[model samples]
Target chain A: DVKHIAKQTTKTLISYLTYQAVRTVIGQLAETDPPRSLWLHQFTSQESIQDGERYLEALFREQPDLGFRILTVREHLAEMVADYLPEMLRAGIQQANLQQRAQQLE
Target chain B: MDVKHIAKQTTKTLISYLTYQAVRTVIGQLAETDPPRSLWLHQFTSQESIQDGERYLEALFREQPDLGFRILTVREHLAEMVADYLPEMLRAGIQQANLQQRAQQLERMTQVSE
Candidate 1:
C-alpha cells in the first residue's frame, strides 16, 4: 500500500510537471525569442502551434522585452523530468513492493 | 498556500478523461513536431508539473495503447540540428537581455545628461 502510494505520487509528479512545462513554454512564447522563423514549433498540436505563433508574436509586438526568465521555467521543468523520472519510478515501485511484503507479514 | 498551487490542484481535480486526452494530443503534437526543441527545453521549469503531465500521459497511453501514432518524433530530431541550435537560441536570449539592460541604463544616463 505504501509502495502504491509512492507509485501514485511519482505518477502525479510526472503529470503535474509536464503540464507545468507546457504552461511555461506558452508563457515563454509570450515572454521570450527570435526564431525569426515566424512560427514557434514548440506546441503539441498543429492548431495549438499556429495559435502559439500568433499569440507569441502578438505578445512580442506589444512588449518586445519579455526576456529570458521564460526560458528558465522551461529549462527547470525539463531538467526535473530528465533527472528524476526514472529514479522516482523505481523508488516508487520498490516502495510498493516493500509495503506489500510488510502487509503480508501482518 | 499560493494561488498558483491552489489553481493547479483544482485543475488536477477537475481534469477529466477528455481533458487528459486533449492534453495527450497536445503533448503528442510537441512530441511529434519537427525539430523537437521544445521537448528538451520544457523539462526545467517545474518538476512536479512535468511528473503530473507524464503520469497523465501514461494513463492515457494505457487506455489507448493501440492508438496508431508516432509519438517519439521529437526524440528522433533531438540529436540532429535541434539540439545544436539550442545553445545558440539561448545565447541569443542572453544577448537580448544584455542589450535591453544596456539600453535602459543608457536611457537613464541620457535623461540625466539632458
Candidate 2:
C-alpha cells in the first residue's frame, strides 16, 4: 500500500533515534555521575538485547535506579520534537525509497 | 563513512533486520496454518543476495508480492500489540521515534560557538 514504505522509513529512523537517546543518556550521565553511567554503558554493551522488553526488564532487576533514569531521559527526548515527527517520517521515506530504486536500477 | 552516514547506514542495517524478522514471523505462522505456503516462502527467501536490503525486497516484490503485503500486516500487527497499552496513541508512539537526529543538530551547533 501507500503506507508500508513509510512505516519502514519511520520505523528504522525512530529505532535509531531511540538508540541515540539511550546512548546520549549514557554519556551525559558519564559526566554528571561517573560510576552509574559507566556501569550503564557496560551493561548495554554486555547484554545480547535480543528481547528488547526483557532487556529493559533485566535492567530493572539489577539496576532499578538507572532504569528509571534512562526512561526519564528517553521521555524528555520524546517530548521536545513530539510535534515534528509525522512530517519528517513520511518525508524521509520517499527519498530513501528513491535511493533504493536507484541502486536497483544500477 | 562520515557521522551522518553512520546513522543512515545503521538505519539500513536495522531495516534489514526488521525485514528479516518480518519474513521469519510470516513464515513461522504459515508453517503452522499452511505448511505448503510456509515452505514456499522459505525457499523463495533463501537467496544469498539477501545480505543487502533493497536487493532482497526488490526480489520479494517482483516475486511474492503477496508475502510482501503480509509482512506489512505483521508490522502493523506489531505496532498494534503495543496498542493494548488508541488511534492517536499509535501515531504518538511512532511520533516519539521519528526524529531527535533532526532535533539533535540543534545541540551541536548551539555549543559549536567560537
Cα RMSD, model 1? 15.9
- Candidate 1 residue lDDT tens string, B69-98: 222222122212122332333334334433
- Model 2 agreement with the true structure over A1-106: per-residue lDDT tens digits: 2255345444444444445556776888878988878887888777634433344556756775665555555445544443444333233434545664565454
Best by TM-score: 2
- Output the worst ten-in-a-row residue range by lDDT, candidate 1 chain B: B72-81
Task: Provide per-model DockQ scores.
Answer: 0.04, 0.06
Model 2 steric clash pairs: none
When candidate 1 is compared with the true two-chain complex, its DockQ is 0.04
Instruction: Summing lDDT over every window of 10 consecutive residues in candidate 2 chain B, give the lowest-scoring window.
Output: B79-88
Question: How far out, in Å, is residue A37 in model 1?
Answer: 39
Question: Over the stretch B12-63, how does candidate 2's per-residue lDDT look in tens digits?
Answer: 5544545566677888888878899998888887763347545676677677
Instruction: Indicate the worst ten consecutive residues by lDDT in candidate 1 chain A.
Output: A47-56
Residue B104 error, candidate 1, Å = 2.8
Q: How far is B22's C-alpha from truth in model 1 (Å)? A: 13
